Amino acid sequence: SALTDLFPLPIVQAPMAGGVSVPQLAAAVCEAGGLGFLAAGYKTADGMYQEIKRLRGLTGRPFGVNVFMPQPELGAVEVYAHQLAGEAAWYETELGDPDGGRDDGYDAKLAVLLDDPVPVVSFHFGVPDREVIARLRRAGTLTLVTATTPEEARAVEAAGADAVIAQGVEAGGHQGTHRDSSEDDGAGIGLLSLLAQVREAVDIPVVAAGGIMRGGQIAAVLAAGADAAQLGTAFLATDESGAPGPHKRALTDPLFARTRLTRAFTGRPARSLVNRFLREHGPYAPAAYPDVHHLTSPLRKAAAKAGDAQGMALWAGQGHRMARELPAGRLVEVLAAELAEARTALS
Amino acid sequence: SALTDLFPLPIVQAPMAGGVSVPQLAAAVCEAGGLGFLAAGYKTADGMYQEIKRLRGLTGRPFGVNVFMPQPELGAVEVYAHQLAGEAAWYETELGDPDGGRDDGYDAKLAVLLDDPVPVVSFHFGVPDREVIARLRRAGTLTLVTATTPEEARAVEAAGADAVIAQGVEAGGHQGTHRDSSEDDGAGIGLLSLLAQVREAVDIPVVAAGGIMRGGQIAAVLAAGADAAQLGTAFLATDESGAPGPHKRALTDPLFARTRLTRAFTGRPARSLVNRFLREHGPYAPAAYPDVHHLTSPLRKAAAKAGDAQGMALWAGQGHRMARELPAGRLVEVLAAELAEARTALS
């Protein structure tokens, strides 16, 4: 596998936007033998570029950069904004402009990634034109794309991508569906089932993602056909992670015992720890991304500033309670040991 | 493991009520090295007893019998019944009596199982009094209980059960939650995540269940800590399965491409292929089991008689599209080969 040939361990640190996966995190993962990732989501092409340069100065090993696919333009937003008036007053801040960018600097970011190629680039919220995949391939970059169904995985393969990331329903953060609709509600596929379906639907390498917190689960996905395992929440809790303290603390807090997929914070289905904001607005959140995301961004910033986890987007997979707080490099070592231990057991 | 010591292969054929798992199915599984299961759900103690005798004449190998835990008594039922008036008229049959038994012959069935012990007994919809577990243990019967969360699994262990069945959200048929409430809606845990959580929550053997259709997935759960894999949908499609033809046909029918958890047919969350009945009544089905089950039973019988899959409870796990139609014994052989193939790959 061209992908797994880049790094020794079948472990990928999921790109996590919002200041979570900073250069220091990716570097520690890379240096430990895994594939570190930078998140270009919500950053400017320049911001992304600065982190790429930063990381190259931290490690000479392969790493990835994740980018969001532009989203097409859509009454519901107006109603939701109204329902958030109380939040705005409480956090003493104005709601953001719902119409503040849908491309997320896609064109400028691609220019950067093509002018100064990185080892791996992944895409979320859809599939790039096959010309984009081809140009990146020519530049020597491996391409990955998330799929949540075997149909989406076939689309990833048809686009010429090098590998597909099979993200199960257990995953933390945003579901990487190529298109969001009310129908996806309750249609999420468990990773073990999605992995098997995707493996039989395409011939390209598969990276399993969703709820993976232990080396034994990594062995599990490998046994089921995956070439590697991508972990977000497990790394969110590490020291190098730039996730806010209230967010890291919530992962193992009994008061945040459960997670749920919701459009409350961004207008697109994303798994977060259940908190006040989710309980109050989740049932009425409309499918309007990134409109809703822009709308609530100021609210979330204010909540974070105050250290109030009840008003934050506590992205977390279903395995959050198993999060371990230690250096990312040491977590890779523990995962590697658990993986080896599980391998031996299976024989 | 006392459980896996009973049969050579780490494969369990899930008990499936409604005439699906008949003696011939269990026998073929047992004879192939797996653990065949009889379903006592909805049958009288006598009906269950006749199948047990039948099976003993078909195989001398270990098998299991599954029983439903009695359910406590609960306006909503009246409203749902009203909404089903059209179904009653269309299928030209009366709705069943919502108050037609909540114990499901529990006491009489236990008397039978204790007077003429079987190798394995499993429980669904809760946990038996620890005295029941103790008496069965003394009689030489191994006890299994389904859990859908680590909390429920701890309850299973505390009751003294020999093993817990970790049933993930991908599972077909009824979710084995110990108590049903609107809160369980959207709280389902993916099997790979549930398995890891349960493995760290209890010390007793774990049987993984939900979406398992291939030997590689069996290797996957073993790698993650399970002692065996329990498969329902995979066996539902075999020749020995007594599932109605329209039900077996629906599993791979593109027109029934998706599944969803619903209370439409029985008043308790159960995963079925999306069909007309589910689309129409699912959104309004109340949490009232087995009240709703009794209510719709006549409707489902009529639909089945007519071969109309749109009015049937098409129980199926998320891996239904991978169903294979062949003798159950041959399916065990294929699964065994896939398991071995996956083991080798992991090393």
Ligand SMILES: Cc1cc2nc3c(=O)[nH]c(=O)nc-3n(C[C@H](O)[C@H](O)[C@H](O)COP(=O)(O)O)c2cc1C
């Ligand atoms: C903190 C949070 C932020 C995330 N940000 C991104 C992102 O910017 N781009 C992306 O492709 N995936 C993102 N993900 C999803 C991950 O790629 C991965 O699918 C998920 O973390 C898998 O679940 P666990 O989180 O591993 O259960 C994010 C997940 C979380 C936890």
Ligand SMILES: Cc1cc2nc3c(=O)[nH]c(=O)nc-3n(C[C@H](O)[C@H](O)[C@H](O)COP(=O)(O)O)c2cc1C
């Ligand atoms: C046809 C249908 C009927 C079922 N009946 C029972 C039952 O009577 N008792 C029980 O404990 N589980 C029952 N199950 C659930 C199974 O024990 C198991 O959890 C499920 O089949 C696992 O998913 P797949 O179906 O293996 O994805 C049933 C499942 C389906 C498919």
